[PDB]
Design an enzyme around this catalytic site. Sequence first.
Site, short mmCIF file in Angstrom:
data_model
loop_
_atom_site.label_atom_id
_atom_site.label_comp_id
_atom_site.label_asym_id
_atom_site.label_seq_id
_atom_site.Cartn_x
_atom_site.Cartn_y
_atom_site.Cartn_z
N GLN A 199 0.82 -1.21 0.00
CA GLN A 199 0.00 0.00 0.00
C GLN A 199 0.86 1.27 0.00
O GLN A 199 0.37 2.38 -0.23
CB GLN A 199 -0.94 0.00 1.21
CG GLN A 199 -0.27 0.34 2.54
CD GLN A 199 -1.15 0.03 3.74
OE1 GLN A 199 -1.26 -1.12 4.17
NE2 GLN A 199 -1.80 1.05 4.29
N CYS A 208 -5.36 0.77 3.85
CA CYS A 208 -5.40 -0.62 4.27
C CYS A 208 -6.81 -1.16 4.13
O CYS A 208 -7.03 -2.25 3.60
CB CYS A 208 -4.97 -0.72 5.73
SG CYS A 208 -5.24 0.58 6.86
N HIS A 217 -5.57 -1.18 11.84
CA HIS A 217 -5.12 -1.75 10.59
C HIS A 217 -6.11 -2.81 10.10
O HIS A 217 -6.56 -3.69 10.85
CB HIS A 217 -3.73 -2.35 10.78
CG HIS A 217 -3.07 -2.79 9.51
ND1 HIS A 217 -2.90 -1.94 8.44
CD2 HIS A 217 -2.47 -3.95 9.17
CE1 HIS A 217 -2.22 -2.56 7.50
NE2 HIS A 217 -1.95 -3.79 7.91
N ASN A 241 -1.34 -9.43 4.82
CA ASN A 241 -1.12 -8.02 5.07
C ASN A 241 -0.89 -7.34 3.71
O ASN A 241 -0.76 -8.02 2.70
CB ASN A 241 0.12 -7.84 5.95
CG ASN A 241 0.13 -6.52 6.70
OD1 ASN A 241 -0.28 -5.50 6.17
ND2 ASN A 241 0.62 -6.54 7.93
#
Length: 212
Positions: free
Chosen positions: A19, A25, A159, A175
């Site tokens: 990102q 996110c 997150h 992630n």
Amino acid sequence: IPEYVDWRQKGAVTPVKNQGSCGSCWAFSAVVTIEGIIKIRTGNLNEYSEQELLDCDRRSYGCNGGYPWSALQLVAQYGIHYRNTYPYEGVQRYCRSREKGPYAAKTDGVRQVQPYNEGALLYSIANQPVSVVLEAAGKDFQLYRGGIFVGPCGNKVDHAVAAVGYGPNYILIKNSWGTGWGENGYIRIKRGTGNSYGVCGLYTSSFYPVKN
């Protein structure tokens, strides 16, 4: 549900993205649950524009934060474009969703798994990759190299990632910090500790798309 779930095996997960310097996110997280649900129904693994959600989610805050649910709500009311059709720019521009034609795909709704319930979350993951949130602002989470992550962790979730599986002692999480982080971009956080919040607050707010 099985003792082992990994949506990658089923080819329902696209490569791990970065990102960069954006608070998108929530976008990356939502886009993952979409690419998977589409694979489960269609049988075709496609990448969808996180940039689209970044620029167009007016309930979010572009590169300054956002919510996976509102993003998924936007994909159930309109749809989303291919990633290559709306490439990621690591920055928030104006919504250019009408300059690209029809939406590659669309969903039929969004649902929130029961919060503060490991089983409920595990059940959902067993059916499809699920969007989840956790506390990432931690030296420990930040510098994670591999192995089952236990913390230390707080429940100050900040997150949004994607849960693409689980094992008897963890939950496989994808992630969006590039493949250089954790296990090739992935992290296995521990489960079954008795803590409602779940390690790092992982059971706080979980959502997933509903496609027919």
